[PDB]
Amino acid sequence: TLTRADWEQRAQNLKIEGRAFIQGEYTAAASGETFDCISPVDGRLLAKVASCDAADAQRAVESARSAFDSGAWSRLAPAKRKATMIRFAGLLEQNAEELALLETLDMGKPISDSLGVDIPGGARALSWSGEAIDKLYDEVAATPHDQLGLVTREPVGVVAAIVPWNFPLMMACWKLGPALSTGNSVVLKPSEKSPLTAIRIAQLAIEAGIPAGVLNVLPGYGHTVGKALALHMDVDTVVFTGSTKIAKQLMIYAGESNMKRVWLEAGGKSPNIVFADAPDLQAAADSAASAIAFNQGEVATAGSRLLVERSIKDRFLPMVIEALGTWKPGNPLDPATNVGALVDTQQMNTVLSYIAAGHTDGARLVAGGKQILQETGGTYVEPTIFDGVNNAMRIAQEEIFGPVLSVLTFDTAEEAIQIANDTPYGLAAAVWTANLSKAHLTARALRAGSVWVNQYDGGDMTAPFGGFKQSGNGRDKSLHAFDKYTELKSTWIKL
Amino acid sequence: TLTRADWEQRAQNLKIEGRAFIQGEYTAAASGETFDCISPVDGRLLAKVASCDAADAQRAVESARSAFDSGAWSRLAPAKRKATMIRFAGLLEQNAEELALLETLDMGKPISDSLGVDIPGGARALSWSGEAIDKLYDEVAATPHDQLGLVTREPVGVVAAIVPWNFPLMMACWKLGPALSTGNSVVLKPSEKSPLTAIRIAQLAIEAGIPAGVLNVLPGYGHTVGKALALHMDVDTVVFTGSTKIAKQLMIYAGESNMKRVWLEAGGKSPNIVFADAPDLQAAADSAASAIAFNQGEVATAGSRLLVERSIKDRFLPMVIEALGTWKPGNPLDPATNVGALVDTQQMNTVLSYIAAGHTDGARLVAGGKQILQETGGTYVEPTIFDGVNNAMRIAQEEIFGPVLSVLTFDTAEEAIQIANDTPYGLAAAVWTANLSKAHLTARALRAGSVWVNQYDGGDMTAPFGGFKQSGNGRDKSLHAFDKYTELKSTWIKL
Amino acid sequence: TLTRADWEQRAQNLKIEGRAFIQGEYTAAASGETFDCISPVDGRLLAKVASCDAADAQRAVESARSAFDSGAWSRLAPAKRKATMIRFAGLLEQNAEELALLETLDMGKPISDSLGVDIPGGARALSWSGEAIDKLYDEVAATPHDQLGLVTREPVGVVAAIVPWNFPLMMACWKLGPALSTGNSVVLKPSEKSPLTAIRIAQLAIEAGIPAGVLNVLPGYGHTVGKALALHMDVDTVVFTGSTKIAKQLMIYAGESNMKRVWLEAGGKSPNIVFADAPDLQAAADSAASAIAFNQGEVATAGSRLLVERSIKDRFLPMVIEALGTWKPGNPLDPATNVGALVDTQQMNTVLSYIAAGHTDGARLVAGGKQILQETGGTYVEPTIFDGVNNAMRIAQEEIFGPVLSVLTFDTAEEAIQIANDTPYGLAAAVWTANLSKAHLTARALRAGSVWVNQYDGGDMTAPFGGFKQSGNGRDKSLHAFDKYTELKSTWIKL
Amino acid sequence: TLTRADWEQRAQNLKIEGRAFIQGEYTAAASGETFDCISPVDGRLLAKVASCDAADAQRAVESARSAFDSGAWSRLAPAKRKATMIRFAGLLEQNAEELALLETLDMGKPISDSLGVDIPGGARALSWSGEAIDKLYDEVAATPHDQLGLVTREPVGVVAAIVPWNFPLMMACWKLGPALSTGNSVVLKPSEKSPLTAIRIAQLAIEAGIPAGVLNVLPGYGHTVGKALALHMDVDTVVFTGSTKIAKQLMIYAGESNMKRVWLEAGGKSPNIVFADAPDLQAAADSAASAIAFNQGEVATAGSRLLVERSIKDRFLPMVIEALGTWKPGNPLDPATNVGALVDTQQMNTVLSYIAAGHTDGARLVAGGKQILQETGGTYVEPTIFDGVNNAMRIAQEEIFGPVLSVLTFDTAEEAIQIANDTPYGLAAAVWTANLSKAHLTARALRAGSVWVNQYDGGDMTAPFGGFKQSGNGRDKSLHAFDKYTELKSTWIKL
Ligand SMILES: NC(=O)C1=CN([C@@H]2O[C@H](COP(=O)(O)OP(=O)(O)OC[C@H]3O[C@H](n4cnc5c(N)ncnc54)[C@H](O)[C@@H]3O)[C@H](O)[C@@H]2O)C=CC1
Ligand SMILES: O=C(O)Cc1c[nH]c2ccccc12
């Protein structure tokens, strides 16, 4: 296992690709323009990254359409797409240390998180979706003796995948795993905040046997190359993870253009509900802390509203505070670090503005509240807890996307449910109770795509993942993620 | 069987409800405004129908939300919803002769059509959907021993259904069936061109045991109450059948509103591909004629592009022409009538303007081509055929929505596919051939939601129905229709 | 509601068919032999029932094969079979009062039982099975592009169903429902102890539109016509509910015959596990009493082993005892009667001999324990409880098939499972506890086909039913029941 | 690629294990007895193989029961059983040349068949079933709001797998892949004719991470160790592939003992039906030859009745004869050989007795008929064709299990169907036609588990495989094979 010094040497010794990837080749943007990729770790210049626009989009869509029409991947045998997808995942694992290090330098998460959560997680999404292609079965209808009716699925065609920066490789693999498996071509627009891992893996896909043009990568700004894709006339489906504001704008784009399919995964204000009869109080405290502190609160499913029953609130809130103190911001290149940098100064000041709004709304600060380690030139905020929060307050309604917990109270399960669902979101939620009926009945009433019971951030590749309401449409991971990339056909045959 | 005279008297003795239906009662629009419901049969004024606006949408959606939250329907046991759903169908079949009379009078299709296709059709969508409720199963994932991972479906909440006028009852039941069966509340916006059946079955649902507020009906204009419903912020899902141009608009409204779910059934330019080696040319010719004549050619899955292998086109065309002669417009209240009125003056002049375009385009008119029965006080076009159409032509590329055939020819099976897929649409297509290989391979390359082989207008309630590309997203009929009215939840339980 | 007097007259005025049913007509056995059908209510002679033998099996199976091969049923469209199947159910509900009277008179269960459980129960198995026919889908495999791989189901052919006497109509419908719905032909051998309902619904099926020969009924003895059917070489599948000792025999016959398929529903010694922390002790006590009293304890899923946490056994037992007092044998033709006659003199002396064994075994009798109502001319045992039973005891290990409770105690949840799984059986079990973890983990370790939690006699038509180990193979009810009446075919088509 | 001399050197240099494997260790039979393993290639002594009996069975079942109860594999996480199963398959591929060579020396098939069909095929069955564990989902019922009903599958417990000698490693992997995946313990009784590969892989499983006792291997005679397993009281399910005679006797064993589950895969007389409109006549001829010649006719799905339409029979039968001549018996250690030895002299003389019976029945010999290469001390029979065969004849009814083709005629498809189904078997069948309707309609009418169209021996791991009628119960390969190793449980929970 590598020391801190070991990692800082590796970061020095990287040659970092910054070019786009189109038709099996790395390429500049047609303008030749670039944008600067700056690390949140120290502030250094990682690379000069190609800044793509509509022309670069049009080139990539033509490469996607061409490759798809050729059938070189979309009609390649399903046992062979399995093999190739599994090889693709293993090449992520082969160069895990390079890819993890790129992910830490690019958006600022702890190297030990990247090495042990992100890169394994993205490979997992690829290899699992690969294992599943030939385990899937389409349907025959019950038809009269002179009819045979097939209901089959086929690749939609060309998929645009616009992903965010909080889990750059993992989120993109969550889109690529199912989309690439079902035979589609994918044009992949990573975040401007985190272009480095999507850029590197394009060569890795080619080397695994993905045919040229089946996976092109277009780094650049959302309002440029991203808009262009969402607005393109030859793009069939767009998949997306990011701000509820942009997801909504994507829908408009689709209706303004070719009426493409739009699948969104937007934000969340996920309630974490601890009941007085929780089986292990310490586990819930540890989990409540981990729910807001992990990946410096830049998590869509962050447990950002802690919902406690009064009977235990006085005993519980110190337990949470003590757990949350084990989560200390640090040098993201240090393997012992578990809280990293916020992605950029912009993210840092939104977080600090919300903390202020916590005071202004009337809540009470009980831990954190400050930016630390500014001597580094990095951007870090200590995890922060607010108490006496009321669900109408700005820090209970609006997604903060930082390590900032709100704590509310309730007396009955009917109340807890009502407060948990008093949000435009529905991405995740948690229930802690040892009572069988209360456990299941509360899971039913929670309008959230993911409901964890006696644990937080649960699920593996078998669990679908996505939101209710303004939190998204569709589900990533699992067999259901495939449905966003396929189209049902009814072949009815007279005999 | 009832005679012409019989229906003429029955029509005269109908008493027609025109009101909207909210919270278990008939009602006016808040404004008190109405619009004249005019029958294309002879100008007869059927009734003065409520002209609802945004104020009424808000009343209805408030009603829906209360009903849904109360659980009277949404948490009523599956098997009980099933029985209710089947009774609902039963009441359609009980009032079949009135409902069919309303259909024919409001939008001008033949009464024998209405009695024999629409009412049984919409009834079955209600009953088959109810039959399947308790036959469904949600999933249990392969988890480690200390986990229980449930993957379940829940109703989204309140569903807005905006439905077209070509099949007023049945198109609505395609939505009501699954949407009501999954336990949602529905606000149903019928066509201003055809409100009568939707208005009517509202009472019928109450009587079947549907609770007040679970199904509310709002007659009125697309650009008033229809646009308000898709812009409403407490409407979780919108489902829509109709024009591609308006379907695009709903995607935009959703983006502008609450990021609600948007399922679209839109336009169509479906190809009918007849190979020389087709088993029965007579059968292919009668069905080619039926494919464009039935329901006045106002069918989204109409076979408006007839693609013929040149090697038989000199022989096949007269068989199509002669077959089409048996489809003759007449009194829609005559049981003998197989072609009815067009829906209004507006619709007739689109059809007539496109026939004019055909001559402009360079096409040869070989059958029909005129407006008929001007004496009636009603709107009628003869089934019309254009020969020598080139796929780039206007009457080939654009949907006409009347009895207008475009006849194209092809030298290879590959040419047949290029031409078939050379459209922004993908609702349906058909393939006539007795070759086992040619049939299935051609079916695969057709980017259409429904592919009929050696038949036209194939499938029953077990076959999904919907488009590729700009013809829509999602499927009506079958078990897949249920997906557009539910939301997936992953309940991961640590043990 | 009909009165005691009412049923007494109705019974007296019944005219009872006793004949067998082959090829659409009632008939005698070839021999002309009959056997006396004697009512356990008072010795009354209901009718002289056809005593069929191998000659009749061959006639019936010849009939079945012709019907099946003709296709009148086996290749009739799914949706048409569905309607027929539902009408069949309809005719059971139409003649519910006669059918129930027959059930109660033939095998001596309370008329309120028959009217309210058996007839609706068997009716629903017929209707729910018919409802699901067209809701099923067969599969399409992920193949290379030049292949089409269908995976479909077809009816096996002619099914022999030999059914027990504890639930004569419903147990038969559990087989008829799916077996008829998948389109097989059935030869149904009711119990010699209870032929009347099976004989009767044969007419009813003809009238529902079941073709002649598709359902044939052969009353008679297990060791004559029953053994012949399972030994017959044109019978593709045999399905059987009844004794473990006879179920073993059918496996042997199949080996000796045509290697036909053998699906078994057999014996039971199901455990009822009551933890101290159960939510409602009253609810657990009433249901423990119901679990052994209902239907005279002649239930395979009867809760004959009541496993109690010692920490509540001194408190819980009187609640079970007192509850059991409300179950009192009486006139089975009295609507007030909740415990009926035992099925015959033979059955009564097994129950009485096992009660004697209980005293021999070392158990303490705390309730009941006697034969009752000797004056009636009929066979009755009081619901009986033994306390201090050790799991090795005879009355613990062997099925008694009467109202006889054995009460055991346990110190740990692990002990509760050891004792529960310490039996050759695995039909059912239940677990009372309010702990979320204890409930689900205990449910997993119970090697039983049905596990009921915080309730007894759980499930509806959607839940599979059948044993682990020597209680059987395969499942009745749900969609899985259909698997025992179909055969899978892989049609791989090269293109 | 290895030469013939290269392989004969390797066969000299093998140390060959002949011991049983029980509880992670190789072990003698409790008697110390052995039997001689003699190669059909030259006649040499391969090893002295442990001859197991009931005591060795009892030891192995205790090891299986113990390992299963410990949960060390049956409750190990499904993603980890996937990993282990895939590692197990890769160790087959790592030592493919040793394992293929053992398979060729032990039962006499061509080394190039073993290396390229058998060993890849068995690894494929293991790795595929491994990939599929966490792609499988159990079910939640549609239940009232106060009920949650799970339908889950669990490992049956202890599985006995008795496999034949025609594909020793592949057939055993077809049982092991699904049985080991679902968590069961497997006791594996290979053929006495082919013990070597099952013996070797036991170490390979241990080395892949299969826990000790989860896979024990018991070589020895069917009437000894095999009978004992089938008769054992603590064996839950028996799976089997072999003679219809023994399969039937296994059923008797199960009923004589513990009423265990019995899954059988017995013989076949598979019709290969070539129609005059077959798309490629030469392909059908080549396939018809390959259908009987491949693996020297020792194939259950061997195309042993060629069904030809008269119109082409005179043109077709020479084409088959010419193809069949390219299939020449040879030294099984030669890589160019494609027909090997019959397994033993006993097999050789059954084949020769049937060839004689061909003449006696009245058929006419047109190719082969003789034993050749006796100078070798090996046992070889040249592929043989009989013409003018009638379905009543002994070589058209009785399975030969040699390279012996029967050829019959027909004039209509109704006739062909009738002759194809005029058999007690139903394992496979083939249809050759370019006509769409005839292709599908004939596949429907064929009572066979596998129906190939325009190809023979089709299917991959996605296609189930098993028989109708006396040809077996259940299906190997695909997701359905898992059902023989699991048990359904209905967990119904009141809330
Ligand atoms: N198409 C198919 O599925 C196959 C059919 N066969 C048929 O079987 C013969 C050749 O193969 P065999 O191995 O002799 O079939 P078989 O049924 O005699 O042998 C199958 C396996 O069980 C056997 N066995 C025999 N008696 C047993 C008993 N009393 N209890 C338990 N197991 C017992 C053997 O030990 C072997 O491991 C014929 O030549 C024939 O064609 C054989 C293999 C495959
Ligand atoms: O079971 C058999 O008799 C052999 C067999 C079935 N399917 C096969 C595919 C490839 C090679 C051999 C077989």
Numbering used by the authors:
A (entry chain C), B (entry chain A), C (entry chain A), D (entry chain C): 3 to 497
Task: List sentences quoted exactly from the publication behind this structure.
AldA from PtoDC3000 was determined to function as an indole-3-acetaldehyde dehydrogenase through comprehensive metabolic, biochemical, structural, and in planta analyses. AldA was shown to be essential for synthesis of the phytohormone IAA and as a factor contributing to the virulence of PtoDC3000.
Enzyme assays using the AldA C302A, E267Q, and E267A mutants showed no detectable activity above background rates in assays using up to 1000-fold higher amounts of protein compared with wild-type AldA. To further examine the reaction mechanism of AldA, the AldA C302A mutant was crystallized in the presence of NAD+ and IAA. The 2.85 Å resolution X-ray crystal structure of the AldA C302A mutant in complex with these ligands was solved by molecular replacement. The overall three-dimensional structure of the AldA C302A mutant is a tetramer with each monomer consisting of an N-terminal NAD(H) binding domain defined by a canonical Rossmann-fold, an interdomain linker, a β-strand oligomerization region, and a C-terminal mixed α/β-domain that includes the catalytic cysteine and the aldehyde substrate binding site. The AldA C302A mutant structure is similar to that of the previously reported wild-type protein with a 0.24 Å2 r.m.s.d. for 497 Cα-atoms in the monomer. NAD+ was observed bound in the N-terminal NAD(H) binding site and IAA in the C-terminal substrate binding site. In the AldA C302A mutant structure, the adenine half of the NAD+ molecule is bound in the same orientation as previously reported for the wild-type enzyme. The nicotinamide half of the coenzyme is bound with the ribose oriented toward Gln349 and the nicotinamide ring pulled away from the catalytic site (defined by the C302A mutation) by contraction of the coenzyme structure. This orientation of NAD+ retains a hydrogen bond between the ligand amide group and the carboxylate side-chain of Glu267, which is positioned into the AldA active site.
